[PDB]
Design an enzyme around this catalytic site. Structure first.
Site, PDB file in Angstrom:
ATOM      1  N   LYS A   1     -66.323  19.576 -16.476  1.00 46.84           N
ATOM      2  CA  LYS A   1     -66.270  18.030 -16.049  1.00 46.84           C
ATOM      3  C   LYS A   1     -66.462  18.060 -14.475  1.00 46.84           C
ATOM      4  CE  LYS A   1     -64.454  17.451 -20.397  1.00 46.84           C
ATOM      5  NZ  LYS A   1     -63.148  17.470 -21.068  1.00 46.84           N
TER       6      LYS A   1
ATOM      7  N   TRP B   1     -55.644  15.234 -28.379  1.00 48.58           N
ATOM      8  CA  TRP B   1     -56.937  15.759 -28.483  1.00 48.58           C
ATOM      9  C   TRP B   1     -57.117  16.672 -29.494  1.00 48.58           C
ATOM     10  CZ3 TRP B   1     -59.404  20.657 -26.397  1.00 48.58           C
ATOM     11  CH2 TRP B   1     -60.851  20.585 -26.214  1.00 48.58           C
TER      12      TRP B   1
ATOM     13  N   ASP C   1     -53.440  22.234 -20.184  1.00 48.44           N
ATOM     14  CA  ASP C   1     -54.701  22.201 -20.378  1.00 48.44           C
ATOM     15  C   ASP C   1     -54.978  21.483 -19.229  1.00 48.44           C
ATOM     16  OD1 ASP C   1     -57.184  21.183 -21.178  1.00 48.44           O
ATOM     17  OD2 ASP C   1     -56.684  21.167 -23.460  1.00 48.44           O
TER      18      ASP C   1
HETATM   19  C1  LIG Z   1     -63.110  18.667 -21.503  1.00 42.51           C
HETATM   20  C2  LIG Z   1     -61.810  19.056 -22.191  1.00 42.51           C
HETATM   21  C3  LIG Z   1     -61.346  20.656 -22.459  1.00 42.51           C
HETATM   22  C4  LIG Z   1     -62.386  21.802 -22.258  1.00 42.51           C
HETATM   23  O1  LIG Z   1     -63.675  21.611 -22.380  1.00 42.51           O
HETATM   24  P1  LIG Z   1     -64.686  22.863 -22.161  1.00 42.51           P
HETATM   25  O2  LIG Z   1     -65.885  22.040 -22.427  1.00 42.51           O
HETATM   26  O3  LIG Z   1     -64.265  23.803 -23.477  1.00 42.51           O
HETATM   27  O4  LIG Z   1     -64.507  23.408 -21.112  1.00 42.51           O
HETATM   28  C5  LIG Z   1     -60.264  20.850 -23.023  1.00 42.51           C
HETATM   29  N1  LIG Z   1     -59.154  20.003 -23.139  1.00 42.51           N
HETATM   30  C6  LIG Z   1     -59.452  18.623 -23.058  1.00 42.51           C
HETATM   31  C7  LIG Z   1     -58.361  17.730 -23.353  1.00 42.51           C
HETATM   32  C8  LIG Z   1     -60.780  18.292 -22.618  1.00 42.51           C
HETATM   33  O5  LIG Z   1     -60.869  16.924 -22.286  1.00 42.51           O
END
Ligand SMILES: *Cc1c(COP(=O)(O)O)cnc(C)c1O
Ligand SMILES: *Cc1c(COP(=O)(O)O)cnc(C)c1O
Lengths: 396, 396
Positions: free
Chosen positions: B246, B130, B211
């Site tokens: 999410k 990511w 994460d």
């Molecule tokens: C969605 C996501 C996050 C965090 O998203 P926030 O909108 O900041 O809460 C972090 N890491 C990954 C890999 C994600 O898919």
């Protein structure tokens, strides 16, 4: 990995909250953090806010991410509130606004932005001032210098000392001004002094940064922004970190804004893209609720009318408590005259207590205030005013 | 001061939003950002969330600042959700949780914390991975190294290549693992592999950082946390950045948490004080609304029941769309077999498209996806699936 980490020093302002938590004494008086209290010693949700939140509950159909810079309407209303409904800055598209998590968050975004994208190395803040300023800029890697500001004996702005101190600030240096309700002195420049500072700033090549957390608490929404506007009229570039924590009583929803102004639309858009990059690697996008409330209220004639009156009522209750405080102090036996308190704008009382007296007020009387001698007048009520003054007289 | 600022490069993921905005074509398909869509192509507010927000509207009596670390209940519920209702970490008070503005915000707090308070100099992230990870840690001044992870031809986790890459990571290095629903591959370690990684980590002296943004989207709330729990059982110290964006559909309210774990209660409290110091100079305190909703739902049996079912429905709709996607692809003439898509957990489809194909999908068909070839399956509906597959077959 964490075996040798040192305990961080407590925050001189936010740390009071923790102490108040510990102290188990029945009638302790919280005059620390600058939060508004009503006559009942409660920090209520504004009626206009409740109405806006009601509206959001029924009309919100999604919580999908906002853009990096937040709610577009929010930014529009913030610029109008700062520069005036028909300002040239807005007409010429010279300003961009990013919604941020509180005014503090806006200051952090400004700091990261400057540190990474400009040649700025120094930021000048007033002394006395607000401790969080030094802490935030220092964390971004910028050094903080201080400039004189207060005449401790006459209880007025020492304009001469201010100008003498600022003469040491070189072109390219950032100079931080409190928009109104200077924290903690409550003494603000007159319009003529602002105008002189605006001209001096242009000539010395300083980059003005305004911390505007109390718009509306001095005289009025428009009047309180005249200093900033005097600057915006002569400057090609400037930065404004504003907050809605106090004027909307939205403290915990973290509603702020960082506004960037440049010579032209082309330049501000390029610079703003870098500000967005600083946000992306921080919290990504801002919290919707708080800012949504603000935009709803400011864009709806009816809700706005209600909100402006509530703001006016808060300002007036504080000014009322100032008089009572002084009066009760005299009739209680105060050997010193604190009438100078009346001139101070905002929520605080400043200049008459030492750090030892503040300590004794806490330990012996359960009265909590900041070590600098700043007391939150907005925390004074007709009910706690008597015991409050008796305690103060006892340590004078 | 801003005359020479360079335009910042667009974000490979969040930048798609801007492009979608510009494109004025009628039926464009947004398969970019990882947001859940229902069968109607809308990102709705969960019913449980609406009920919680209703409750808050009627019972909230103040918006006074939360403490630096946020809502205490929120932290309690987050720890239970991560380590298990009766975990030893919780019993031994070895963990502290700070509410943050989203999972991204939690990562930034973790980064600032590590950079300023420890000897960490390197953070290891998977490749593919990511993009935001490298960006956030780099901004905090830490260098990012990558470790192999995906078997591009067999479409499985290349455990051997993973271990070989990680052998270059020295004691004191941070290793970032995706808790479940690896972004973008959707391939997660089996429990046995997690256990092997947990043991290897302890022996090499790595500081694991998890994460966790998709708890509940792989198999289930508890099942999805077994990897993390395997680590928590053998490690004295670890860090967890989690998100509720999410699983609660609270994207724009920025609801996250940064959890710190230490050998003992004494150590974690000392370390956590420094984490709070990193927050104080950033946004000060977190936004109340989003987190309040989460705590209300997780602490109320009835609301929790409703929420868990909605989560289950989201997970199931995605898994349903995966099958339809593969099936429609075959009956549409796809020369390549994409059945490997079924094994992938989470919201994405990954591994079958090149960056050129993605570009052509955008330009020629109005279909938006990430340059890496990641498509958001959660954005596929029974209505846009036909045109979507026809476009894909056309560029294969
Ligand atoms: C969605 C996501 C996050 C965090 O998203 P926030 O909108 O900041 O809460 C972090 N890491 C990954 C890999 C994600 O898919
Ligand atoms: C209240 C205040 C702020 C900003 O507060 P937030 O809660 O972060 O919005 C900034 N500067 C001063 C001087 C303040 O009094």
């Amino acid at each position: 990995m964490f075996e040798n980490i040192t305990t961080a020093p407590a925050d001189p302002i936010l740390g009071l909250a923790d102490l108040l938590r510990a102290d188990e004494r029945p009638g302790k008086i919280d005059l620390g953090m600058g939060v508004y209290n009503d006559e009942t010693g409660k920090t209520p949700v504004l009626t206009s806010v409740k109405k806006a939140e009601q509206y959001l509950l029924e009309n919100e159909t999604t919580k999908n991410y906002l853009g990096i810079d937040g709610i577009p309407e929010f930014g529009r209303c913030t610029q109008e509130l700062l520069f005036g409904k028909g300002s040239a800055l807005i007409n010429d598209k010279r300003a961009r606004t990013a919604q941020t998590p509180g005014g503090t968050g806006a200051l952090r975004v400004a700091a990261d932005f400057l540190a990474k994208n400009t040649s700025v190395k120094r930021v000048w803040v007033s002394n006395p001032g607000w401790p969080t300023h030094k802490s935030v800029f220092n964390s971004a890697g910028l050094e903080v210098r201080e400039y004189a500001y207060y005449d401790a004996e006459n209880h007025t702005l020492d304009f001469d000392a201010l100008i003498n101190s600022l003469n040491e600030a070189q072109a390219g240096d950032v100079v931080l001004f409190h928009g109104c309700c200077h924290n903690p002195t409550g003494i603000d420049p007159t319009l003529e002094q602002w105008q002189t500072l605006a001209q001096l700033s242009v000539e010395k090549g300083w980059l003005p940064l305004f911390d505007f957390a109390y718009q509306g608490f001095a005289r009025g929404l428009e009047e309180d922004a005249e200093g900033l506007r005097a600057f915006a009229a002569m400057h090609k570039e400037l930065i404004v970190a504003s907050s809605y924590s106090k004027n909307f009583g939205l403290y915990n929803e973290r509603v702020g804004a960082c506004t960037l102004v440049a010579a032209d639309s082309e330049t501000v858009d390029r610079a703003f893209s870098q500000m967005k990059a600083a946000i992306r690697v921080n919290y990504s996008s801002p919290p919707a609720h708080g800012a949504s409330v603000v935009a709803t209220i400011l864009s709806n004639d009816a809700l706005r009318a209600i909100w402006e009156q509530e703001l006016t009522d808060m300002r007036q209750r504080i000014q009322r408590m100032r008089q009572l405080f002084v009066n009760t102090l005299q009739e209680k036996g105060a050997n010193r005259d604190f009438s100078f308190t009346i001139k101070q704008n905002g929520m605080f009382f400043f200049g008459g207590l030492t750090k030892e007296q503040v300590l004794r007020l806490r330990e012996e009387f359960g009265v909590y205030a900041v070590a600098s001698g700043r007391l939150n007048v907005a925390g004074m009520t007709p009910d706690n005013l008597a015991p409050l003054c008796e305690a103060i007289v006892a340590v004078l």
